[PDB]
């Protein structure tokens, strides 16, 4: 499924993910895509960060508004 996500340094882009794609895995996916430090990557859904170990499907990242992702790197 395609989830809507807004990166701090990007726009609202669509990311295709699998139903079994874990939230942390998705974090790592976005980190991979734009080459950002996942350890310093902050994902926001409904205001809070989602559990790192669970399916992205059952977390409603495609249903409940748009996902916000911001990076907080110390050196970049």
Curated annotation (Swiss-Prot):
Record's protein name: E3 ubiquitin-protein ligase parkin
Lineage: Eukaryota, Metazoa, Chordata, Craniata, Vertebrata
Shown segment, full-protein numbering: 1 to 76 of 465
Its biological purpose: Functions within a multiprotein E3 ubiquitin ligase complex, catalyzing the covalent attachment of ubiquitin moieties onto substrate proteins. Substrates include SYT11 and VDAC1. Other substrates are BCL2, CCNE1, GPR37, RHOT1/MIRO1, MFN1, MFN2, STUB1, SNCAIP, SEPTIN5, TOMM20, USP30, ZNF746, MIRO1 and AIMP2. Mediates monoubiquitination as well as 'Lys-6', 'Lys-11', 'Lys-48'-linked and 'Lys-63'-linked polyubiquitination of substrates depending on the context.
Description of post-translational modifications: ISGylated. Conjugated to ubiquitin-like protein ISG15 upon IFN-beta stimulation. ISGylation positively regulates its E3 ligase activity. Auto-ubiquitinates in an E2-dependent manner leading to its own degradation. Also polyubiquitinated by RNF41 for proteasomal degradation.
Annotated localization: Cytoplasm, Cytosol; Nucleus; Endoplasmic reticulum; Mitochondrion
Disease entry from the Swiss-Prot or TrEMBL record: Parkinson disease: A complex neurodegenerative disorder characterized by bradykinesia, resting tremor, muscular rigidity and postural instability. Additional features are characteristic postural abnormalities, dysautonomia, dystonic cramps, and dementia. The pathology of Parkinson disease involves the loss of dopaminergic neurons in the substantia nigra and the presence of Lewy bodies (intraneuronal accumulations of aggregated proteins), in surviving neurons in various areas of the brain.
Gene encoding the protein: PRKN
Tissue: Highly expressed in the brain including the substantia nigra. Expressed in heart, testis and skeletal muscle. Expression is down-regulated or absent in tumor biopsies, and absent in the brain of PARK2 patients. Overexpression protects dopamine neurons from kainate-mediated apoptosis. Found in serum (at protein level).
Additional comment: The parkin locus (PRKN), adjacent to the 6q telomere is hyper-recombinable and lies within FRA6E, the third most common fragile site in tumor tissue.
Modified residues (Phosphoserine): 65
Quaternary structure note: Forms an E3 ubiquitin ligase complex with UBE2L3 or UBE2L6. Mediates 'Lys-63'-linked polyubiquitination by associating with UBE2V1. Part of a SCF-like complex, consisting of PRKN, CUL1 and FBXW7. Interacts with SNCAIP. Binds to the C2A and C2B domains of SYT11. Interacts and regulates the turnover of SEPTIN5. Part of a complex, including STUB1, HSP70 and GPR37. The amount of STUB1 in the complex increases during ER stress. STUB1 promotes the dissociation of HSP70 from PRKN and GPR37, thus facilitating PRKN-mediated GPR37 ubiquitination.
Highest taxon, organism lineage: Eukaryota
Every Ubiquitin-like domain range: 1-76
Comment field on protein domains: The ubiquitin-like domain binds the PSMD4 subunit of 26S proteasomes. The RING-type 1 zinc finger domain is required to repress p53/TP53 transcription.
Family stated for the protein in its record: Belongs to the RBR family. Parkin subfamily.
């Amino acid at each position: 499924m395609i989830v809507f996500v807004r990166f701090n340094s990007s726009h609202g882009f669509p990311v295709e993910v699998d139903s079994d794609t874990s939230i942390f895995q998705l974090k790592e996916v976005v980190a991979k895509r734009q080459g950002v430090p996942a350890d310093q990557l902050r994902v926001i859904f409904a205001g809070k960060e989602l559990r790192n170990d669970w399916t992205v499907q059952n977390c409603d990242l495609d249903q409940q508004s748009i996902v916000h992702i911001v990076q907080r790197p110390w050196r970049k």
